[PDB]
Every structure is written in C-alpha cells, then in structure tokens.
Amino acid sequence: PEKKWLGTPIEEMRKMPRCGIHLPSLRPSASHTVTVRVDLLRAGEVPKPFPTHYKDLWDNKHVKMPCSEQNLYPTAGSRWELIQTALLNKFTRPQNLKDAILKYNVAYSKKWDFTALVDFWDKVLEEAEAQHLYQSILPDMVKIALCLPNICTQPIPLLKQKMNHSVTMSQEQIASLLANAFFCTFPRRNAKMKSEYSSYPDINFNRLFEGRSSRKPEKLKTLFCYFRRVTEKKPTGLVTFTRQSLEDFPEWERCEKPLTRLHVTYEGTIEGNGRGMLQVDFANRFVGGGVTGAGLVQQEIRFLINPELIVSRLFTEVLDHNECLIITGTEQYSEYTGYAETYRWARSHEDGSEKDDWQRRCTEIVAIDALHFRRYLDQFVPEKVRRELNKAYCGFLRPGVPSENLSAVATGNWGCGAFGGDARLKALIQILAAAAAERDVVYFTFGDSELMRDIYSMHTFLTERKLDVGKVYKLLLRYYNEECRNCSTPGPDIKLYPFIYHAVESS
Ligand SMILES: Nc1ncnc2c1ncn2[C@@H]1O[C@H](COP(=O)(O)O)[C@@H](O)[C@H]1O[C@H]1O[C@H](COP(=O)(O)O)[C@@H](O)[C@H]1O
Numbered sequence: 001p002e003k004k005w006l007g008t009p010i011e012e013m014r015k016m017p018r019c020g021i022h023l024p025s026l027r028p029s030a031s032h033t034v035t036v037r038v039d040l041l042r043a044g045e046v047p048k049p050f051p052t053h054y055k056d057l058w059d060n061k062h063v064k065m066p067c068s069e070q071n072l073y074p075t076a077g078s079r080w081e082l083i084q085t086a087l088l089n090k091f092t093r094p095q096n097l098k099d100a101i102l103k104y105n106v107a108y109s110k111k112w113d114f115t116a117l118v119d120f121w122d123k124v125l126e127e128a129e130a131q132h133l134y135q136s137i138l139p140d141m142v143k144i145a146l147c148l149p150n151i152c153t154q155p156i157p158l159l160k161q162k163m164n165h166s167v168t169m170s171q172e173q174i175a176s177l178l179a180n181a182f183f184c185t186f187p188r189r190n191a192k193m194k195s196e197y198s199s200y201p202d203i204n205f206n207r208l209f210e211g212r213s214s215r216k217p218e219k220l221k222t223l224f225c226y227f228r229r230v231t232e233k234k235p236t237g238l239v240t241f242t243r244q245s246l247e248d249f250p251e252w253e254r255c256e257k258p259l260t261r262l263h264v265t266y267e268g269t270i271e272g273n274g275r276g277m278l279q280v281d282f283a284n285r286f287v288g289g290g291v292t293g294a295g296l297v298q299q300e301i302r303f304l305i306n307p308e309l310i311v312s313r314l315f316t317e318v319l320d321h322n323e324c325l326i327i328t329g330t331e332q333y334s335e336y337t338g339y340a341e342t343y344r345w346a347r348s349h350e351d352g353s354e355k356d357d358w359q360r361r362c363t364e365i366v367a368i369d370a371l372h373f374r375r376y377l378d379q380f381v382p383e384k385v386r387r388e389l390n391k392a393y394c395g396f397l398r399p400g401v402p403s404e405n406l407s408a409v410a411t412g413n414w415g416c417g418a419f420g421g422d423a424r425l426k427a428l429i430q431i432l433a434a435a436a437a438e439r440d441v442v443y444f445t446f447g448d449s450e451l452m453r454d455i456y457s458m459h460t461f462l463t464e465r466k467l468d469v470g471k472v473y474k475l476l477l478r479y480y481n482e483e484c485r486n487c488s489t490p491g492p493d494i495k496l497y498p499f500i501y502h503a504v505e506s507s
Pocket residue numbers: 028034035036037038039050052053
C-alpha cells in the first residue's frame with residue numbers, strides 16, 4: 001500500500017523557535033508601529049498600552065475608531081456615547097442585542113437581517129447555554145468593547161497598497177477591537193457606496209447574523225468560543241501584522257538556485273503538523289475572504305480558528321499581485337471538522353506554542369491569494385505562471401534574514417478545486433518559489449495519496465537531474481508553447497508532469 005509521507009523526514013525541517021534569529025529589542029520605527037509599552041512587557045502579564053491615555057487620529061491614514069470624538073450621529077452628538085448607552089443594557093432575548101446594535105446603525109435597520117442570530121440563540125443553543133451567553137459572555141464582550149479607548153490608545157495606521165510596514169499589537173488590544181466589530185461599531189465600514197474603505201474587507205460582524213444558512217451557527221460557535229476564552233482569562237501575548245510588497249522578483253527563466261528539500265504527505269494539517277513553520281493561508285486578496293459574511297472555504301477557515309487574524313481586515317487594504325500579509329503570534333482557539341457545507345465546530349483548542357522574546361506565539365501565517373481560473377488553460381500562460389510564482393515568493397521571502405534561520409514552508413493545494421487551480425502545477429510553482437526564497441517545503445495533500453506520490457516523484461526527478469529553477473521554468477514555457485497555446489479543448493492531451501519526464505528523457 002501507499003505510504004503516509006515521502007521525502008525529507010519532517011523532523012529534519014527547520015522550525016521556530018529553534019531556527020529563529022536573535023530578535024533585536026522591540027521598538028517603534030518608521031516601518032514599525034508598536035502599540036504597547038515595550039519597557040513594561042513581561043511574560044504572563046497583560047501588556048500596557050502606549051501612549052498611557054487615548055490619542056485620536058481621524059484621517060485617511062489611520063483606522064477611524066468608534067471611540068473618536070469626531071465620530072458623530074444625529075444636533076450632531078457623540079456616537080460613542082450612544083454606543084455606550086445602547087450596549088450597557090441587559091439582554092435576555094436576541095431582539096435585545098439586535099435593537100441595541102441598531103441604535104447606532106439606524107440607516108441599516110431594514111437592511112440588516114438578524115435571523116441567524118435569533119435562530120442560534122433560540123434554536124441551536126440549549127436554554128442554559130443561552131443564559132450563559134447573555135448573562136456572562138455578552139456583558140463581558142461589551143465590557144472590553146467599551147474599554148477600547150483605554151486599551152487601544154495609539155492610532156492604528158492603515159496598511160495601504162505598496163506599504164512595507166508592521167503593526168505590533170497585544171492580543172488584549174485585538175480582543176477589544178474584535179468585540180467592537182461584533183457589535184458593529186466601526187464607522188464608515190457599512191455602506192455599499194462607501195468610498196474610502198471600498199478597497200478594504202468588511203470588519204463589522206453584521207452579515208454573520210443574516211439569513212437561514214446552516215453555516216452561521218457553526219461560525220458563531222467558533223467565534224463565541226474565542227470571546228469566551230479571552231473574557232474569562234485575558235491573553236498576554238503580542239501579534240505582529242506585516243504588509244510586504246516587493247517590486248523586484250527573480251529572473252525566473254535564468255534563476256540558478258537549486259531546488260530545496262521536500263516533505264510531502266496525504267495525512268496531517270497545515271495548522272496542526274506545520275507547527276513552527278511558515279503556514280500558508282490560501283487567501284482572498286481581501287484577507288479573510290468572506291469570513292464575516294457567508295464564506296466558509298479555504299479562504300475563510302483559518303481566520304475562524306485563529307480569529308485574531310480577523311482584526312487584520314480592519315486595517316489591511318486589498319492585496320495587489322506583488323503583496324502579502326504576514327501574521328506572527330496568533331493563537332488557535334478552535335478545532336473544526338469538514339469544509340463548506342460540512343464545516344462544523346468541534347471543540348475549543350488550547351494553543352500550547354512557545355513565545356518568542358517579543359511575547360509572540362511561535363506561529364507564523366502568510367496570506368497569499370492565488371488567482372481564480374475560470375478557464376483552465378489560462379494558468380499555463382507564462383504571464384500567469386509568473387504571477388503565481390511572484391505571489392508565492394513574496395509570501396516566502398524574508399529580506400535580511402539568513403536562509404538557515406528560516407523555517408520550512410508548510411503548504412498545500414493553493415487555489416485549486418473550485419477556484420480552478422491545477423494541483424500539480426501549483427505544487428511545482430510553490431516548490432520553485434520556495435527554492436528561490438531558499439526555504440524547504442512541507443506539502444500537505446489532504447487525503448490525495450496519488451498526488452503525494454506524483455509531487456515527490458517529480459521533485460526527486462528534477463532534483464536528481466540537477467535542474468535549477470530556471471531549467472524547470474523553461475520546461476513550463478515549452479509545455480505552454482507545445483501543448484497549451486494552440487489547444488482547442490479545455491485541457492491538453494499530454495499532462496504537465498508526463499511532459500516534463502519525456503522532455504528531459506528525450507533530451
Ligand atoms: N511603544 C512605544 N512607543 C513609544 N515610546 C515607547 C514605547 N514603549 C516604551 N516607550 C518609551 O520608552 C521608555 C523606556 O525607554 P528605555 O527602555 O530606553 O528606558 C518608556 O518610558 C516610554 O516612554 C514613554 O512612556 C511613558 C508614558 O508615561 P506618561 O506619559 O503616562 O507619564 C513616558 O515616559 C513616555 O516618554
């Protein structure tokens with residue numbers, strides 16, 4: 001029978017914290033916003049905010065905070081005071097939460113449906129679970145939500161396109177912001193015809209409450225698990241959000257870098273078995289995809305189980321082709337089973353990972369968006385091969401960091417299935433990109449054992465015949481020109497891997 005894994009033994013791959021560089025002291029710079037007191041940062045203690053007291057910026061370079069005094073509502077009065085007054089009330093029934101949220105969202109009183117929240121509260125939860133929800137969890141969420149100005153004292157810059165910039169933030173700060181998103185308090189993030197934020201993903205959680213989909217109660221469970229944890233016990237770690245945008249990329253056709261090591265397996269998960277490795281989030285260019293709406297596929301799932309990722313939607317503009325988002329220090333709060341319609345919340349997860357010197361859990365996630373291919377052959381066009389290579393490379397490269405201090409890339413079938421990607425091409429693309437970035441690859445095929453074998457066989461062949469990135473890229477070009485360009489059927493008669501074997505063996 002087929003084996004469970006092939007290639008380099010996974011324990012020989014590099015992983016954090018062991019492989020990590022010595023971190024320099026944490027400090028703010030022009031490229032790094034730090035919202036906590038670094039001199040007061042201690043293990044197991046909730047970080048203190050810097051500055052000591054709330055400072056406001058209401059402009060096109062920073063998040064528009066709900067607690068801003070320039071956040072106004074019909075005389076024009078303080079919307080924050082109206083938020084406070086509406087949410088500092090007792091909820092016994094789901095309509096009470098709905099009505100509270102709608103007091104400072106009156107324009108959406110008709111357009112925001114709450115059927116899934118009502119159903120969740122009254123049909124899915126048992127009586128005692130609901131009491132707990134409205135007697136403990138919801139008041140505790142309101143509490144940290146209204147402390148926003150005491151917790152998030154420093155303005156948060158928007159990570160716009162082209163910026164190479166980092167925001168480091170406490171998990172406690174993220175909790176207060178995510179509580180605010182739940183209660184839908186973020187201004188200028190709601191309208192269809194919104195201008196300033198149309199290039200940003202949704203942050204407010206309103207669409208989690210709408211419609212009759214069975215996906216919603218599973219999403220709400222997942223999120224209330226998170227809110228329960230961080231209100232019962234305040235998290236003490238930091239998380240770093242980094243936008244990375246590269247203008248220059250390898251000259252793929254002539255790249256002389258050799259292929260790196262591979263571990264490929266049809267069992268295991270990226271988040272479970274890629275511990276301490278760069279974990280690829282198969283993202284939407286709007287990071288988190290439809291996580292706060294109806295989406296529940298590869299683009300959303302990691303944002304649910306590591307819900308601190310969701311906060312990135314507050315300040316991360318849509319990714320361009322040459323961009324990615326790197327998140328360090330998020331915690332896994334939930335386990336799940338299934339996918340899409342079969343997604344279900346299994347149980348809470350106790351993340352047991354170590355922390356680095358900046359008190360960030362040794363978990364690194366990179367969101368990179370593949371293209372969607374609505375015509376299958378489009379992805380073999382060299383220009384599209386290059387686009388994916390460059391996207392993956394941007395996700396993997398760490399300017400300034402020696403390669404020996406880089407963990408393996410933990411990845412899988414990026415943008416395949418219903419998104420249109422070919423698994424075997426995308427595997428080879430990620431292998432080539434990892435080679436250029438001088439990282440090893442741990443590839444999870446999620447049940448597909450023939451694919452595990454085919455990937456390994458190809459990697460072994462190319463490695464043994466000493467084909468560098470450029471030679472392999474040249475074979476991709478030959479495959480395009482000889483089999484794809486003039487192909488009048490949806491797929492070509494000869495496949496990619498068989499073409500490569502034959503071309504090398506004929507040559
Ligand atoms: N994230 C940060 N951003 C900016 N400054 C910071 C940060 N973290 C610490 N500091 C500052 O770096 C200093 C430690 O520097 P050393 O490790 O080299 O010794 C800290 O004192 C911090 O100074 C400021 O925070 C204080 C706020 O106090 P009140 O305004 O409520 O009175 C105040 O002193 C102010 O100047």
